[PDB]
Scaffold this active site. Sequence first.
Site, PDB file in Angstrom:
ATOM      1  N   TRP A 116      85.129  34.649  56.430  1.00 43.59           N
ATOM      2  CA  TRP A 116      84.056  35.481  55.888  1.00 43.59           C
ATOM      3  C   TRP A 116      84.489  36.141  54.579  1.00 43.59           C
ATOM      4  O   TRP A 116      83.698  36.284  53.643  1.00 43.59           O
ATOM      5  CB  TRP A 116      83.646  36.563  56.893  1.00 43.59           C
ATOM      6  CG  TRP A 116      82.692  37.548  56.298  1.00 43.59           C
ATOM      7  CD1 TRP A 116      81.328  37.456  56.258  1.00 43.59           C
ATOM      8  CD2 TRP A 116      83.039  38.716  55.546  1.00 43.59           C
ATOM      9  NE1 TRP A 116      80.807  38.493  55.518  1.00 43.59           N
ATOM     10  CE2 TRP A 116      81.834  39.280  55.069  1.00 43.59           C
ATOM     11  CE3 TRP A 116      84.252  39.339  55.224  1.00 43.59           C
ATOM     12  CZ2 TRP A 116      81.809  40.436  54.284  1.00 43.59           C
ATOM     13  CZ3 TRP A 116      84.228  40.489  54.443  1.00 43.59           C
ATOM     14  CH2 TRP A 116      83.012  41.023  53.981  1.00 43.59           C
ATOM     15  N   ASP A 149      85.973  35.899  51.308  1.00 42.42           N
ATOM     16  CA  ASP A 149      86.268  34.847  50.338  1.00 42.42           C
ATOM     17  C   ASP A 149      87.638  34.977  49.683  1.00 42.42           C
ATOM     18  O   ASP A 149      88.113  34.036  49.047  1.00 42.42           O
ATOM     19  CB  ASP A 149      85.196  34.799  49.241  1.00 42.42           C
ATOM     20  CG  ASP A 149      83.935  34.084  49.683  1.00 42.42           C
ATOM     21  OD1 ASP A 149      84.023  33.214  50.578  1.00 42.42           O
ATOM     22  OD2 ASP A 149      82.852  34.375  49.122  1.00 42.42           O
ATOM     23  N   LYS A 166      86.016  45.309  45.202  1.00 49.55           N
ATOM     24  CA  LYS A 166      85.606  44.085  45.874  1.00 49.55           C
ATOM     25  C   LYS A 166      86.260  43.961  47.249  1.00 49.55           C
ATOM     26  O   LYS A 166      86.270  44.922  48.016  1.00 49.55           O
ATOM     27  CB  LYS A 166      85.932  42.874  44.990  1.00 49.55           C
ATOM     28  CG  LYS A 166      85.125  42.830  43.682  1.00 49.55           C
ATOM     29  CD  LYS A 166      83.701  42.292  43.886  1.00 49.55           C
ATOM     30  CE  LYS A 166      83.715  40.793  44.154  1.00 49.55           C
ATOM     31  NZ  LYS A 166      82.355  40.191  44.303  1.00 49.55           N
ATOM     32  N   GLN A 224      76.435  45.205  47.389  1.00 52.35           N
ATOM     33  CA  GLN A 224      77.576  44.442  47.883  1.00 52.35           C
ATOM     34  C   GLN A 224      78.751  45.344  48.222  1.00 52.35           C
ATOM     35  O   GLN A 224      79.326  45.248  49.304  1.00 52.35           O
ATOM     36  CB  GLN A 224      78.056  43.402  46.871  1.00 52.35           C
ATOM     37  CG  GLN A 224      79.346  42.730  47.363  1.00 52.35           C
ATOM     38  CD  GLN A 224      79.818  41.588  46.495  1.00 52.35           C
ATOM     39  OE1 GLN A 224      80.346  41.790  45.400  1.00 52.35           O
ATOM     40  NE2 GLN A 224      79.635  40.371  46.987  1.00 52.35           N
ATOM     41  N   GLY A 268      73.871  40.348  52.075  1.00 49.51           N
ATOM     42  CA  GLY A 268      73.584  40.161  53.487  1.00 49.51           C
ATOM     43  C   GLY A 268      73.652  41.451  54.275  1.00 49.51           C
ATOM     44  O   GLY A 268      73.361  41.478  55.470  1.00 49.51           O
TER      45      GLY A 268
END
Lengths: 779, 779
Positions: A468, A470, A614, A668, A688
């Site tokens: 999941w 990346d 991130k 995100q 998502g």
Amino acid sequence: MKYGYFDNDNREYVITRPDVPAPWTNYLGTEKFCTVISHNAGGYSFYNSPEYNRVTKFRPNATFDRPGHYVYLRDDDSGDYWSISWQPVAKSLDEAQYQIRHGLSYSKFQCDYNGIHARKTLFVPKGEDAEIWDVVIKNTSDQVRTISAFSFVEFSFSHIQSDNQNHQMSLYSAGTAYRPGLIEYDLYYNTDDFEGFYYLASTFDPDSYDGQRDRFLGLYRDEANPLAVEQGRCSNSAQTCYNHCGSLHKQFTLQPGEEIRFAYILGIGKGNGERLREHYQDVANIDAAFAAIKAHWDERCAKFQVKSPNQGLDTMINAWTLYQAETCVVWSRFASFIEVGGRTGLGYRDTAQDAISVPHANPEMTRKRIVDLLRGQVKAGYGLHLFDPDWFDPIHGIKDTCSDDHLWLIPTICKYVMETGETSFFDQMIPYADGGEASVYEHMKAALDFSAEYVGQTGICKGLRADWNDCLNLGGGESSMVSFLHFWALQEFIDLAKFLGKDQDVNTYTEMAANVREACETHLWDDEGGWYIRGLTKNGDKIGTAQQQEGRVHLESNTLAVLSGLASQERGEQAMDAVDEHLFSPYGLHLNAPSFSTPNDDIGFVTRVYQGVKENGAIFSHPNPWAWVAETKLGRGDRAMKFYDALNPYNQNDIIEKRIAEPYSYVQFIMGRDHQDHGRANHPWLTGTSGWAYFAVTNYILGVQSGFTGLSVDPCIPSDWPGFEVTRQWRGATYHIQVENPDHVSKGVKSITLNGAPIQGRIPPQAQGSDNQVVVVLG
Amino acid sequence: MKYGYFDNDNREYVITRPDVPAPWTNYLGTEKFCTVISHNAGGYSFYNSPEYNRVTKFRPNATFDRPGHYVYLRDDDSGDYWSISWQPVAKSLDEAQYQIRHGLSYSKFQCDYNGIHARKTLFVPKGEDAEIWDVVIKNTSDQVRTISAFSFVEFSFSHIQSDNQNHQMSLYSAGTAYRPGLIEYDLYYNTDDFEGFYYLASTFDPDSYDGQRDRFLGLYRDEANPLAVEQGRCSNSAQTCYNHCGSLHKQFTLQPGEEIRFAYILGIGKGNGERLREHYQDVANIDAAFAAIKAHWDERCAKFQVKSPNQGLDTMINAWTLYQAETCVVWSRFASFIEVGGRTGLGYRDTAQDAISVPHANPEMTRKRIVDLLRGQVKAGYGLHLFDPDWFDPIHGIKDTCSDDHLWLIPTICKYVMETGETSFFDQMIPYADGGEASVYEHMKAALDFSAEYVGQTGICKGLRADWNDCLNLGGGESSMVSFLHFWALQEFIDLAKFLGKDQDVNTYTEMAANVREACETHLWDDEGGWYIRGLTKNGDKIGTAQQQEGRVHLESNTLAVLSGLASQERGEQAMDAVDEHLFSPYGLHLNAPSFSTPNDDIGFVTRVYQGVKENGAIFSHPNPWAWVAETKLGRGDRAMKFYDALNPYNQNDIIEKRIAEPYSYVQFIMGRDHQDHGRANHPWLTGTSGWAYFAVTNYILGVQSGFTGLSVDPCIPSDWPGFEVTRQWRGATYHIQVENPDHVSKGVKSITLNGAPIQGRIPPQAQGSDNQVVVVLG
Ligand SMILES: CC(=O)N[C@@H]1[C@@H](O)[C@H](O)[C@@H](CO)O[C@@H]1O
Ligand SMILES: CC(=O)N[C@@H]1[C@@H](O)[C@H](O)[C@@H](CO)O[C@@H]1O
Ligand SMILES: CC(=O)N[C@@H]1[C@@H](O)[C@H](O)[C@@H](CO)O[C@H]1O
Ligand SMILES: CC(=O)N[C@@H]1[C@@H](O)[C@H](O)[C@@H](CO)O[C@H]1O
Ligand SMILES: [Ca+2]
Ligand SMILES: [Ca+2]
Ligand SMILES: [Ca+2]
Ligand SMILES: [Ca+2]
Ligand SMILES: [Ca+2]
Ligand SMILES: [Ca+2]
Ligand SMILES: [Cl-]
Ligand SMILES: [Cl-]
């Protein structure tokens, strides 16, 4: 600091001052034509494919969000001009008052300036591949005013790459021609009379027009000060080659208090412009189209409405989060102000997860996406990480295969059938991406078998290219996240097999699940720290232990261990307590802690990413809902709500100076504690997180779940909640659910009554059109 | 209308008014660091690879050419500010006087405004991978002035695609840090301490700085009105993530008449910024660096200088065209304001042709490019259409192979050896792109043999993917252009074989050439129209006949038939008369006429292109020089000069309202008679027209040609020319050539004397350092 507020009555977010620190966008369109528009009318449109059918241009990642869909107004007595959207003219905010109302599939722009009131509603009507610009101009001054209106859009060369580069070819690939109230844009190399032509039309008969960008804007000028607007007239340009635009102008004389209404239409295909400019000359047709857009979402929102003690939750679940989730299902993830070229189509794990969120509101699109994903699966069982569904509408190697992609589809397909009751779907034959075919049921088994095959010597799933995360690239290494997801998928499939009476498969996959649980409980628990590790490197070194200096506690492993149902109540509580103690912040849950700082390719690229950014130590939103679900399974509703409130954009409406991004949209990631910009939210809309948040709240906190044989209501809420109410539409019947919590517990159903009669277990599906009263008492 | 003039004495083009209808650019750099800069200081820099090592950003194809390398000046007593380049501040031209001097590898910007004189010279010094901004500020007012200076560049994420898209990754891929007079930019994912770091330094010790673009520019502002400049101070920003810039500020107090000098340095690599900011604090080091750049071109220009009756020819050949041609050889064709992403590396036919133009001035780079091309050739004999030479620095199929690519290398290699005398080059072993190796000589034979193999049943070369004309796609069809090029290459190779004593090859290729000539003379001549056809479709239908309605006369076939030496004097004259009568225009020669209008895929994409645009009926510059050469071979110097004068940018210095593009640069194409913008020039600088024009004028009009055994002088000039003079450096010796035309003929040498003694034929190479007087009398 705040720049607007939520208007619950009208289901709109009202922006009261346009100088927001970033573009706050909205999505127009529900079928094939889509527009990503900001509160300053910046943005662009595309048809079906953002990469190959962009309609108007966009210069991204700049201080201004241009070009856009603009309407310039000019006082022909003074020469003064301004735009209905604040930018691009940017008339002083001490002189002009602007307001923007972003609604579901429409945006309303308003400007009150020096005696002129102007409104512009942008929306893509159902049934047409075009965008309507409904404009109203009213003279609120005490004298006669003469106002000219000018439109502007810069036509795209259609392929994003052709707008950004290779102009040696693209500058000579299109042309404009003019017909009454219609600028026709011809993509000369596109032979299709529909996709190869765009247009900008006006319901009024123009006084002047411009099809050449350089003539409308003028030399050494841009969208802020177009030559045509400054001089009060277009140059009536139209020719082949160079850059094209869609500018139509008309002058109006308004008596004091008088108002006029007209529209511009941006669209695709020959013949449509001439037709629609005539159709909308009757404003009743514009109002009818708008009413259809309101109906579209009224119908969807009505299928799940909640009334609880938490206003932020109600506001978002009853509209904004449903909206964001469905936008992801319909438009995918590659068209925003951040995704502006390159990747296009469908991301496997992304749409697989998104599709579990709104089958109750849009079953047709949910089914379509599920079929897309099944067609994008190979015989081996894994999914194509990134693909275009149009490719398979009636292939990479294992090295590019991500270990989690295919597994997400299992719970989603099961949910789709539970929701719709379309049990025959399992027998449908769908071709594999690399040849051959199999039933939906067998496609699912191919996925489950793949993850059983690709494991390490201790029985943990290999991470492959990435899981999941990346940036967690283990290859031969093993991922705790994937094994937990495998267990969840297996639990879902086992229930399906039982329901279908597939005894053989029940035994096979029950055994497989048993082996996964034993392997995980034996190898993934860190008894010194009291949590589940993230995985192991190819060399057998554990990732995420109490003794390491970097990346000790991870959100994915600990939340999924519980969400999947694998972890025991005891280990689940302790693992989630580690999550709360070490990852929680006022802005949400961090992905890992401490952040990684030492490059280690045995772990992944995450070790080369900035701390608190991130995947490396930031508040990655997507997995936060997994924590909410985990907490409901542990029966700790207060803990779940604490996490929900911290991430809920709604509650950050007045901290924009820190958040920056839209308070009505999940993003995100939010900069983590390790970065100086901690609190800043990044990448709204296409995440998502929206679908997962909606799924988590509706199915686990509120606890409403559709099933193969009945509807379940098993909420996990804050103990101080006196109760709540939910209106749920399922399989054509309505369920008016009332939850009472007199003893103030968090989870546990004492009784459930259906239409006055006590029942045990799930609520059987009632007759079509029936209305049912469901009273659930907790205790 | 004109915007400047040529300054012959200083070898610079002077722009007197900055509101030019398009950006007029120049190229800085001669080694690895390059900057494409406009007269408004817009543009960008890159290191070695424009695609993967861009240094500063560029938003292309817009009304403004931003960002750029800007210096903002501010009067700290009034708050007024302006830039040294007109844009981006764009101070009124009624108040400020601007001047830009584009020179060879440097650009000088000047601004005189309200008592302040400012100069900024931008140039990339030899020996460093950086750009120096030499700034001089002088107070010309009668009072003390306080002026602040601010620099600005927006750092690139290095990969062009990352600047244009995929910001979900690139926005978090870099960071800035500050040290005294140095903003250090870190490409976080690039581990190389050299290529992974950029910087912007100042020789002065800053008063303030800004590394974050959003802080320097400010919210809802751009390069035209930076917040930092408006307020008079930077915010001293520096952090990881988001968009970065290089802004260094310093305030200066100037007494009346006082001037100060300082510099900014934009560069690459850790350690270099701190070193160079200190090095250039001594302005003598800046002057020394500039002197080295002047020497670089003085040395090159001196190797071929002409004095003739034609000022335009002299001005261009003695500087501008040599400059443009060498710029192509050194920097290739993929870094301009038109080529801004995607294609990168070397275009096979492009560099193969470019390399024939300046071996006398830059033999080292010419050799390097030739070796690059040989390494980019496959065993089959054809060349890789587009490739990166770094790939092969110690592969597509036949379907993507263009039929002409490889043939251009033959005349170029022969010329290189003729020029340098490096005969041993033919024996050098060079690997083929697809494995194996062969001598340079054998590589050449592989190319010649390929074109003999891929022919039709009548002996004409197949067009394959495309021939020289990228839009003439014949496949199995046949190209007249390729057969003529094959003949030319064969003639060149035969002469080489004779010189080397390779009797067997002489017979083999003489026979091959004989067959090509017979086949062409029998099948390609149209005796009704009086010209050579363009080719034949795969179905045998001739393309370019007197009976067709579209595309009757073509420039490529008719010019090359003569240039190659294949056509007879009789057919050559008539074919070229067709070219003159039907293709000539005051702006140059059209590529074909009439233009194509009916789509025909048997011919190619050219039939789907707008009339008078690009390959379909426009004045495509590249083949024009071929016409000049053809005319000299026919002995018609007046005709050749008529064509030269019509295309010479110099002669269009005062028709900018129509031309638009730079009057000192050849462009790809000028809109043809069939387009309403007929006369507008497009795509300056990186066009092979420059190398071919230089080669055509120096070797055929002036007729000076180096050879394997001697130097030839056989001019073809206008009959009214009394004569001309040329200084030619060849193999370390100088030849002072004086051509006399007492009988006023166009071509034909009556006598040639070397140092007073009459000689017959070529001038043998004289001793190193010798100076020789050559008198050529025509008659
Ligand atoms: C009409 C047109 O766009 N022609 C261009 C051609 O000039 C260019 O050389 C080639 C490069 O790949 O692309 C296109 O064929
Ligand atoms: C740190 C970083 O840039 N991560 C991104 C990741 O979020 C994204 O999902 C992926 C898509 O291909 O690209 C990169 O790995
Ligand atoms: C559209 C897309 O590639 N989204 C990815 C998602 O699949 C991945 O799970 C997550 C964590 O790495 O990062 C997002 O950027
Ligand atoms: C860099 C490049 O691809 N240049 C091509 C050139 O090779 C071709 O011969 C000519 C005619 O089609 O068009 C140019 O654009
Ligand atoms: Ca009023
Ligand atoms: Ca078209
Ligand atoms: Ca009902
Ligand atoms: Ca003075
Ligand atoms: Ca670096
Ligand atoms: Ca000498
Ligand atoms: Cl995301
Ligand atoms: Cl060209």
